[PDB]
A paper describes a structure:
Abortive infection (Abi) is a bacterial antiphage defense strategy involving suicide of the infected cell. Some Abi pathways involve polymerases that are related to reverse transcriptases. They are unique in the way they combine the ability to synthesize DNA in a template-independent manner with protein priming. Here, we report crystal and cryo-electron microscopy structures of two Abi polymerases: [name] and Abi-P2. Both proteins adopt a bilobal structure with an RT-like domain that comprises palm and fingers subdomains and a unique helical domain.
Residue numbers in the entry:
A (entry chain A): 0 to 188, 191 to 599
B (entry chain C): 150 to 188, 190 to 299
C (entry chain E): 0 to 188, 192 to 599
D (entry chain D): 300 to 449
DNA sequence: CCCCCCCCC
DNA sequence: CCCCCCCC
DNA sequence: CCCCCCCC
DNA sequence: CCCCCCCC
């Protein structure tokens, strides 16, 4: 029944290996049988809107976890205050949203706690009746099903009321969590479940309390419980509504029903320091607006056949992209995100010949220079949140017959033509800390083997402060892929960065508790694998006259010296086990060549 | 499509009554140069002007529209406009008097407008300020004929 | 010079006795001579917009400070975390603001620190160039002078960019105060700012979300924060004018605007500040100016004392409508000008004392219209006008308006609108619009309104979700009625004290918890024996309370409560105040809880 | 009818304040579509002085007082106003040329304008280079003319 | 104290 | 030169 | 000419 | 995995 199939989903999700194999990057699997014991690093089962699975994933760390028990490292209390990877992405054309990717250690510390107390989450979730985000887009709980749950919650409503909470994730006071779960008066009196959660959550953001570290499934799960206690307080007051995260739909029929619900709603926000986004408060009167019909979109290619001209397919695809971008302008939320899936599905459904698919996306018209793949590429450069979608779209038409080389050339030519504008855009993303925008360009260059855009001086200028770890890793990979460039200059800019950021901390702080922990692990891993010639390391170390001991060179570059520095080594000893067992957090590639297409 | 690449926004710019208010004596200016024109006959530019005015009783207000010769002369004029703008590292798409300027920073839209207005004042061209508009991504497009066809 | 007048302002403000006598309730005095050694019981020298001076003031505590030195009592470490008075006021008809009135002990600890390190405030203040809010509306630094400063900052500007920070005080992340004063990266590693943060948190029970807003100390702390925001923008060759969180950036080219916005956002993103995108506008020249009061101040330029009293009634009544409509159009603060210019016009036009009584206490037999009843009714449409209305009444009282006639007029209002007022009272309770409640209760105690709430309705005010101030007023209302038995009131107060202590570690001292003001008010009265000690021992024997060396072992007995906590630094502070007969609430001239002349 | 209530008896500060308040009133009036309101600033300030018969030394101090607290000067505000529309170049200069004959010391007029140029030297040069590049002829003429006049 | 009166959080 | 003042 | 059709 | 594709 309903109670049965609910618990199947939750007994599945609440598993430490699942919450890092798919939770760290907020990935989602449709079927349980996709949780293979193999690494399965090449192909994608699940999807995510965040980071490229091929270059950044946990499949190596996951395969370690089902062969080794790591809870030993976390069984103690008093967790370590680690610094996350601050990664800032856009919200509109003129607004932003701040992700924080927590240090893997303090993440697993929080992960194991949530699982050791799965009951305090699950039994509240299954009893809850208003939330359509408590499924986390997981398993068979797709968009049509969350929509269908909302429809039954809005019966009897001549009108609908909308409320959105303003910057809910990033303005959340962490100490509000014991208030919502246990009661504000009960928390004023220590060492409970809510209190221990609060201290583990802040451990992932260097003990700061303004906001939650958003960007992973754990934050999603913790956020859903906080709002499910909201839902429970409103159920006591005999209210009924639908809710997806911070977005409410209250159905009513008389103005007083609305004002009653509005007042009891404000009392809960006042009590828990939540701010109602007033620009988004709206009452919909029947006949009800609904500007989200995808029927016209999904039926765009109805009258096209495999027998249609390759030029016909080119024009219709290009036509279709413009139709959806216009539909998003009219308020059809998600219409642009649908461009990639339906082009993929339509080619498959119409069974276009694999040779004919190459021509469609390879054809550069010598009359107008139009290549439809170039158009899709340029589209994706208009919202860096489309990065994974464009890359999996290429992945799909690639395995359909689009020449990996043809695609690499088209992308190369696009960068060549827009060289001036992209350089200008990079300097902007660097000065104003637009991470994902810089990430997208760097990820495109490493993936499509682009080498003409930046020189070595312009590449080393990327290895600097106020750059996310993901961009640094990508920029490092770009430097290494040119064999002509000498590693000596790269080691200076990297070591200079490592010393500079370690200086801001207390001198007794372990380096794996600091910033740049992911880029640090990436470097130490490549160094232990000796991608950096141990000789070419000693050459640099002697240009700075670095003292030496039995650990090796006393440099931030040497992991063996770093592995011991600091009073609390629980983090260093954590990432130590990972380096020894050659667990990677960044994927070298199929041939370990840092090439990512076939 | 390929001209508008890299643009998170696109600026629209339409000249006002371009065909009917076009000063014929500005045609030599665009092809050769306003300064050079002061120096003054027998040139290709100046003779083209005289063959044009001769079609409309030696009047210089506007070009006689309705035929293809006027379209061709209008393109040549407007292409020397394009070259002056190309020289200044600007990129856009124009159909006759209708410009589409893709950009990403308001600094660019300003740089572009400043030089655009400079050529317009030099050659007695008028911007139709009613049709000036920027489109922010996601871009509107109402020109679709898919459901019609 | 310009810095000559600043240094004199700040050497005066940054004095701990001034910062509580005029800063706790955010008062303002126009002359340094107004800081008299005497307790100004009947002189409202200062101006405030928060709490009625005649009832809630620090003049007695200020008097104790001039004699004793409490810097000795406060020197130490790890300050005690106290719970403030949560007092919620409106922002507009549909919005609210959250004032937090800090425990006196925690407040004074912050006050002494700021003064011992006034150097770190004053040095940044004098050096500042962009802030017109850094004068805190004191001395000869009036609105016209601040506008004159802004005008010279907007020269060379064809356009003005307007930028407002969203919910600034309440959303201000406290730990970001070290970030702005000494840098964020350096803060990863217990200096000046690192301790100012922990003194601030201890005023709001170690909450790090928001600043205790409603007093001068928080305005100065907020000012340092933004004055460092200013130094960062000054290093980038930017010029603008700022008042608290509202910026005006003059510019000419769209280059300069986007240049300014990009840096502005970086500073904001770094310190968890949020920009109110709705109040973001650009004014092109010719510039709008919807805030000119020239027509308001010259409203009475045509009327004289020779004119009929009925004409004065009409022009005043038509003047109130002119200003309320001008506030509608955007002339910000126009309603706040109604009371001053009426008072200043009456004085300047030299209106006789007997005429003022008749102008303001006349009842039209035809229309039942009384102009003072109108002004009162206006004051109840925005509870942030309570102090304005009472100081206005205080002024026409001294000019002739009979205290008796005024009390009768308000009494009549409350009788006509018993239905509505009792609806609004029970509304403000259920939604913690606790200022709107404080106003009604304050009008009742001041104007002697004994016919609105019965005994039961008053007792039902002594509950939770009621702020200390309205609690004190509701208790006063009960006491002002002799026929109400003091026994029932105790049972509501004892139950209330008992219920809020249950929310704490049993080792927590009561004077560190919530309701610290109401507790002090009650304890002071019991020590003064206002609560008949025979009538106290009667109630305790009813509850079968045990009796010990200090007393009857209840929340009501201060001698027992005095020392029942792990950290008694708070109780020991308030105990000294009770012993020396320092009052935080004025019992009145004859201690009859009456406040009219 | 803006200055009708004020007379010679009022303090120079009052006069300075009221004139400063008056410039804002007309500027806002022009913003509302009151065509010509800004061009009326200069005559009615001149003519109000005549009708009210303010003493010569008061004219100097009104237009020379640098308020020690705010460092505000009402003549400097008038000057900054004229640099917002080049077509006010003559109506500002006749205004000075008028109050110069009313008792305003030219040595102070020159000193006040020179301070403005010293203060906004970066901005003014930035604006000059922008006028040459875009062939804005009157805007440049204004700055150059103020330089030679003052 | 010796005319004024208004911005915010 | 003998009160004013502003439209294009 | 050999499943298109529309912009100033 | 066995006519789907989209919300924060
Ligand atoms: Mg939101
Ligand atoms: Mg046209
Ligand atoms: Mg604000
Ligand atoms: Mg504000
Ligand atoms: Mg046209």
């Amino acid at each position: 029944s309903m109670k049965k199939e609910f618990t199947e989903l939750y007994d599945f999700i609440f598993d430490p290996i699942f919450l890092v194999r798919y939770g760290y990057y907020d990935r989602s699997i449709k079927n349980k049988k996709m949780n293979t014991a193999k690494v399965e690093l090449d192909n994608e089962y699940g999807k995510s809107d965040s980071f490229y699975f091929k270059v950044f994933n946990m499949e190596s760390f996951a395969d370690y976890l089902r062969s080794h028990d790591l809870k030993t490292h976390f069984n103690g209390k008093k967790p370590l205050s680690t610094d996350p990877v601050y990664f800032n992405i856009p919200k509109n054309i003129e607004a932003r949203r701040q992700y924080k990717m927590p240090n893997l250690y303090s993440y697993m510390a929080l992960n194991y706690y949530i699982c050791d107390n799965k009951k305090e989450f699950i039994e509240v979730f299954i009893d809850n009746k208003f939330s359509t985000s408590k499924f986390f887009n997981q398993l068979n709980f797709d968009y049509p099903k969350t929509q269908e749950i909302t429809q039954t919650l809005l019966y009897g409503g001549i009108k609908k009321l909308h409320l959105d909470l303003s910057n809910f994730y990033h303005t959340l006071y962490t100490h509000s969590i014991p208030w919502m779960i246990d009661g504000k008066s009960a928390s004023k009196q220590k060492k409970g479940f809510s209190n221990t959660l609060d201290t583990l959550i802040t451990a992932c953001q260097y003990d700061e309390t303004h906001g939650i570290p958003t960007g992973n499934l754990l934050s999603r799960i913790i956020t859903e419980l906080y709002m499910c206690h909201f839902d429970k307080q409103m159920e006591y007051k005999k209210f009924v509504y639908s809710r997806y995260v911070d977005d409410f739909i209250f159905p009513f029929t008389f103005e007083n029903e609305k004002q009653e619900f509005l007042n009891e709603f404000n009392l809960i926000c006042r009590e828990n320091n939540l701010i109602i986004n007033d620009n988004k408060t709206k009452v919909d009167n029947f006949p009800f607006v609904d500007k989200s019909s995808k029927s016209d979109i999904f039926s765009f290619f109805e009258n096209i056949t495999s027998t249609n001209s390759n030029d016909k397919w080119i024009k219709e695809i290009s036509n279709f992209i413009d139709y959806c971008v216009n539909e998003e302008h009219l308020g059809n939320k998600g219409a642009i995100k649908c461009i990639f899936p339906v082009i993929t599905n339509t080619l498959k459904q119409k069974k276009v010949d694999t040779k004919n698919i190459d021509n469609i996306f390879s054809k550069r018209n010598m009359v107008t220079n139009f290549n439809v793949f170039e158009k899709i590429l340029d589209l994706s450069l208009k919202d860096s949140r489309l990065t994974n979608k464009f890359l999996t779209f290429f992945e799909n038409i690639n395995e359909f017959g689009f020449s990996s080389l043809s695609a690499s050339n088209i992308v190369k030519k696009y960068f060549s033509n827009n060289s001036k504008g992209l350089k200008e855009k990079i300097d902007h993303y660097r000065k104003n800390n637009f991470n994902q925008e810089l990430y997208q360009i760097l990820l495109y260059m490493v993936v499509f083997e682009i080498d003409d855009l930046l020189n070595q001086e312009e590449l080393l200028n990327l290895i600097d402060l106020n750059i996310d770890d993901y961009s640094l890793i990508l920029g490092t990979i770009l430097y290494l892929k040119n064999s002509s460039y000498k590693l000596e200059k790269l080691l200076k800019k990297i070591d200079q960065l490592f010393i500079n950021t370690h200086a801001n901390y207390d001198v007794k702080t372990s380096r794996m508790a600091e910033k740049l922990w992911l880029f640090r692990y990436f470097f130490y891993f490549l160094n232990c694998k000796n991608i950096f010639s141990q000789k070419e390391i000693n050459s640099y170390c002697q240009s700075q006259n670095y003292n030496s001991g039995q650990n090796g060179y006393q440099t931030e570059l040497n992991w063996n010296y770093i592995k011991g520095q600091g009073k609390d080594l629980r983090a260093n000893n954590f990432f130590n086990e990972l380096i020894v067992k050659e667990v990677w957090l960044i994927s070298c590639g199929e041939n370990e060549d840092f090439k990512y297409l076939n | 499509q390929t001209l508008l690449y890299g643009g998170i926004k696109k600026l629209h710019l339409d000249l006002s009554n371009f065909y009917h208010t076009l000063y014929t004596h500005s045609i030599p200016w665009m092809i050769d140069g306003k300064s050079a024109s002061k120096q003054r006959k027998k040139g290709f530019s100046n003779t083209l002007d005289t063959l044009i005015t001769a079609c409309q009783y030696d009047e210089t207000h506007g070009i006689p529209t309705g035929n293809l010769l006027s379209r061709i002369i209008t393109e040549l004029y407007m292409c020397h406009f394009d070259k002056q703008m190309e020289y200044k590292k600007f990129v856009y798409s124009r159909y006759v008097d209708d410009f589409i300027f893709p950009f990403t920073f308001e600094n660019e839209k300003q740089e572009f407008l400043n030089e655009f207005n400079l050529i317009c004042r030099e050659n007695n061209l008028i911007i139709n300020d009613n049709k000036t508009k920027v489109d922010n991504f996601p871009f509107v497009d109402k020109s679709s004929k898919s459901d019609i066809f």
